[PDB]
Every structure is written in structure tokens, then in C-alpha cells.
């Protein structure tokens, strides 16, 4: 029973291992194993539940263990190990074959097979930790191991793609430990975590690995948003080390999402409005990306309201996620009509729900835009309106107060009007008739480069896959 369960999963694990083993030996095929490693994460997670945990025990006995004998016992110690044929050396699949890691040449240390075996061993360990939700001592113990090992080994083009996915588990397992319980050991552990990311990021800079630098930047930018340091986030994004070529669309959407929150506090909403739109287009529409689409769609509504523009109501209607978008709908109506008591009671009841995503702190800045939008509505309907006529609409304090809210408006060129005090009314300065000026021609020249921007990323990408057609033989 238990014997047939251990040998079945190990054969499938070696079968997937031999596919990426022969591809890294000859020249550089490394682009190919990257596609296999995408499905390796999903196929291993479903396989971990079946045939219990014993698939990883016989795999370590098969190959040579540099560090991995005591790590399995420590991993099995927390789960109250059940010992069945647990003596090392019970299962031997090598049987002296070249693709099986021939034992005599391996045990005599005349050849080194540890490079691809050890780096692959740490990957399967991190998969079971996230599946079994093992925390506390097992989180810190594995962090003290993998990091010094990566500094000792010299990573090639294919080796840099191994640990590229391991850095995500280091930051993920560290944040789940802090949110579960707060302790002095968690704050000091985060200090080493921050200094470690910057040391390896410099290593990947010389190797110019696309997937490695894409995973690190996404983890580093998130650490800046938690601490809220402006000087660290602004200086990091000025280097522009993020490759846009071979990185996945899921890694791209996460990058544009960080730039929207950073530029939101910089009081420049022109660039931040484009970054939140590009993050939606790059993110897939499947169910696994709904977690990113849920947070990104909530940030888009906050960026629009801070620009003075009001987002469409169909976004809160035709979508299927509007159940969580209900708090933002009442904020939309309160800004339009400019009601004083409507916004106060709106943010009071939902104060608890908006605290989770930290979007309630941005609602304080939304209060200023409540009247600023109402001023734009009354200014477009009335070209010349008396000073006392505005206070009768929005029920403001006094005519002395409303005069200075239009002040903050046209400083940046929002309303584009003038206040005549002697005449006693506010007149709109826009005469339209701007088609004959050269101001539209400035934007017109940008649309030519936008269509030309699609050339170099396209015409060059035709022959890119085509080199395999002429080299391979055809019927």
C-alpha cells in the first residue's frame, strides 16, 4: 500500500526533472525550461495532497544530499513524523545510468552533479511549506539556508531563473508571520530581509535576467509602500532597470500598479491615471487574477475623483464585482451635488471597510474635491453668475468663503475663469474657438509616434520565433 504510493509520485517527479536536465546541458535552451516551470508549480501543488507527504522523502534518498538530509527531518519533525522504512537508503532508482546520476562517479567526487540538484531541491521544499501553511520556526530556518547558498554558487543564465521564484516565497512567508502575530523578533527579521534584497539585485543587474529583475522590483516596491518612505521609492524608480521585453504580463501589471500609488501622493495625477489603466490591460481576465483586478479597480476610482473628473456609473453597474464597490458609489454622488453632510455620513459607516485596503486615508483628500467639482458644474452652466448665487445653491458659509475656493481652482488652470469684484460676478474666460490655435497641434504630433511605437516591437518579432523553422528539418 504505502510502498506503491511512494514510487508512483517519484517516477513522475523524475520524469519532469529529466526534461529540464538535458535541456540545460547542451548550449543554452533556458527559454524552454521557463515554460515548463510555469506548469511545474501547478502540477506539484495538486500532487502534494495525493499520496500524502512521502513523495519528497524518497526523492532526497535517490539523489545526493549536500544539505538536504537534516532539512527533511526538521520538516518532518513539526508534523509528528510517522516512520515507515524511514532509514536513509531504502529506495534506490539510480541503478548506475548516465541520466540517473551514475553513483560511482558521483560518490568518488570526480564529477559535480550538485549544481542542478541542490538548486532544484530548495524549490520543492518551498512548495510544501506554502501548501501545508507551516509557520514559526520553519520559516526562519529555511531563510538562514537558501540565502548563504545562493551567494556561494555562481548562477548562470539558467541558474538565475531557479531562485528567481524563491525570493517570492521569502517575502511572502515573512509577511504572513508578521500579520499573524506581532513580536520584536519580526521587526529585526525584516531588517535583514531588506538588506538582502539589495545585495542580490546588484548581482542580477550584471546578469541582466528579465524574470529575476521583474520579481525583485515587484517585491521591493511593495516594501516601500508599507513603510511609506518617499525618498526610497523615488530614487529606486529613477534607474529604470526593469526590462519590458521578455517579462510576463502578470509581472508587468503589478509594476504599473505600484506607480499609481506612488504618483498619487506626489500631487501629479496625469501620469498616475495612465499607470492604473495599463495595469488593467496587462492583467489577465481569468479568476486567478481577480485578486489583482479587485484592488486595481478600487484605486482607479480614487484617482479619478482626485482629478476633479467623475468616473462613469456603468463601472459600478455592469461589472460583477460591484458588491465590493458599493462604498465608492456613495462617494461618487456626494462629490457631484457637493452636499456637506452627505460625505460625512458616507465615510463614517464604511470607515471600517475602507481601512483594510488603506483607501480611507485618501478619502480625506476627497473632501476638498467635493466642492471643487460642484464649482465646475455651476461654472459651466452659468457663464456670468453673481457671487451670492453660489452660496444659495451649495448652502455654503458666506460669500467671502466661496470667493477663495475659486482661487485654488484656476491656479493650476482647472476652471479657467476670472473673478470681477467691481462688477460683482464671475465670468468664464473660455471663448472656445481653439481649433485655429497651435495647442491642439501639440497633442496631434504625439499620436504619430503612438502609431509608430508599435513598429519596432512588432516587425522585429516576426522572424524571432522563425529561426526554428529553417534550422529544423521539414517533410
Amino acid at each position: 500500500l504505502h510502498h506503491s504510493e511512494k514510487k508512483y509520485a517519484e517516477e513522475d517527479q523524475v520524469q519532469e526533472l529529466l526534461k529540464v536536465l538535458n535541456e540545460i546541458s547542451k548550449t543554452t535552451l533556458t527559454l524552454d525550461p521557463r515554460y515548463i516551470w510555469r506548469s511545474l508549480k501547478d502540477l506539484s501543488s495538486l500532487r502534494n495532497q495525493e499520496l500524502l507527504n512521502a513523495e519528497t522523502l524518497c526523492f532526497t534518498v535517490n539523489v545526493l544530499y549536500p544539505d538536504s538530509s537534516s532539512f527533511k527531518k526538521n520538516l518532518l519533525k513539526f508534523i509528528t513524523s510517522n516512520h515507515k522504512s524511514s532509514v536513509p537508503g531504502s529506495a534506490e532508482l539510480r541503478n548506475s545510468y548516465p541520466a540517473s546520476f551514475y553513483s560511482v562517479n558521483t560518490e568518488k567526487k570526480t564529477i559535480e552533479v550538485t549544481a542542478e540538484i541542490n538548486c532544484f531541491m530548495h524549490l520543492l521544499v518551498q512548495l510544501f511549506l506554502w501548501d501545508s501553511k507551516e509557520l514559526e520556526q520553519l520559516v526562519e530556518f529555511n531563510r538562514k539556508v537558501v540565502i548563504p547558498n545562493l551567494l556561494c554558487y555562481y548562477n548562470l543564465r539558467s541558474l538565475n531563473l531557479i531562485n528567481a521564484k524563491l525570493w517570492f516565497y521569502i517575502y511572502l512567508s515573512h509577511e504572513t508571520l508578521a500579520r499573524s502575530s506581532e513580536e520584536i523578533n519580526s521587526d529585526n527579521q525584516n531588517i535583514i530581509l531588506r538588506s538582502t534584497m539589495m545585495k542580490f539585485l546588484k548581482i542580477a543587474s550584471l546578469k541582466h535576467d528579465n524574470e529575476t529583475k521583474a520579481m525583485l522590483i515587484n517585491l521591493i516596491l511593495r516594501d516601500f509602500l508599507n513603510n511609506g518612505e518617499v525618498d526610497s521609492a523615488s530614487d529606486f524608480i529613477s534607474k529604470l532597470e526593469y526590462p519590458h521585453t521578455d517579462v510576463s504580463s502578470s509581472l508587468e501589471a503589478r509594476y504599473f500598479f505600484y506607480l499609481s500609488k506612488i504618483n498619487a501622493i506626489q500631487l501629479d495625477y496625469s501620469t498616475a491615471n495612465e499607470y492604473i489603466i495599463a495595469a488593467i490591460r496587462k492583467a489577465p481576465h481569468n479568476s486567478k487574477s481577480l485578486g489583482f483586478l479587485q484592488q486595481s479597480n478600487k484605486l482607479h476610482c480614487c484617482i479619478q475623483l482626485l482629478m476633479g473628473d467623475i468616473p462613469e456609473l456603468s463601472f459600478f453597474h455592469q461589472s460583477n464585482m460591484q458588491k465590493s464597490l458599493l462604498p465608492y458609489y456613495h462617494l461618487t454622488k456626494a462629490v457631484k451635488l457637493g452636499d456637506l453632510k452627505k460625505f460625512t455620513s458616507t465615510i463614517t459607516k464604511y470607515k471600517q471597510l475602507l481601512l483594510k485596503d488603506d483607501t480611507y486615508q485618501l478619502c480625506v483628500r476627497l473632501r476638498s474635491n467635493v466642492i471643487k467639482t460642484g464649482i465646475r458644474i455651476i461654472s459651466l452652466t452659468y457663464k456670468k453668475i453673481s457671487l451670492r448665487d453660489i452660496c444659495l445653491k451649495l448652502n455654503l458659509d458666506s460669500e467671502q468663503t466661496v470667493e477663495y475656493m475659486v482661487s485654488r481652482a484656476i491656479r493650476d488652470g482647472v476652471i479657467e475663469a476670472k473673478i470681477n469684484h467691481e462688477d460683482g460676478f464671475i465670468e468664464t474666460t473660455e471663448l472656445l474657438n481653439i481649433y485655429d490655435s497651435e495647442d491642439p497641434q501639440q497633442v496631434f504630433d504625439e499620436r504619430i509616434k503612438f502609431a509608430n511605437q508599435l513598429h519596432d516591437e512588432y516587425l522585429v518579432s516576426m522572424r524571432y520565433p522563425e529561426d526554428k523553422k529553417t534550422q529544423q528539418n521539414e517533410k
Partner: peptide, 27 residues
């Protein structure tokens, strides 16, 4: 799709529309 569906108006129903008939004779 903006300022259209659910917000509506909540005016121009009866009382405001019925008042405009009396203004014709008051001129």
C-alpha cells in the same frame, strides 16, 4: 454611462411640473 442610471434626479416628478401651469395665467 456617467451620471445616468441609478443616481437619476429625484425631482421634476409632480409638484415642480404642476406648478408651471399656474405661471401662464399669472403673467
Amino acid at each position: 454611462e456617467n451620471w445616468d442610471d441609478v443616481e437619476v434626479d429625484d425631482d421634476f416628478t409632480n409638484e415642480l411640473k404642476a406648478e408651471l401651469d399656474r405661471y401662464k395665467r399669472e403673467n
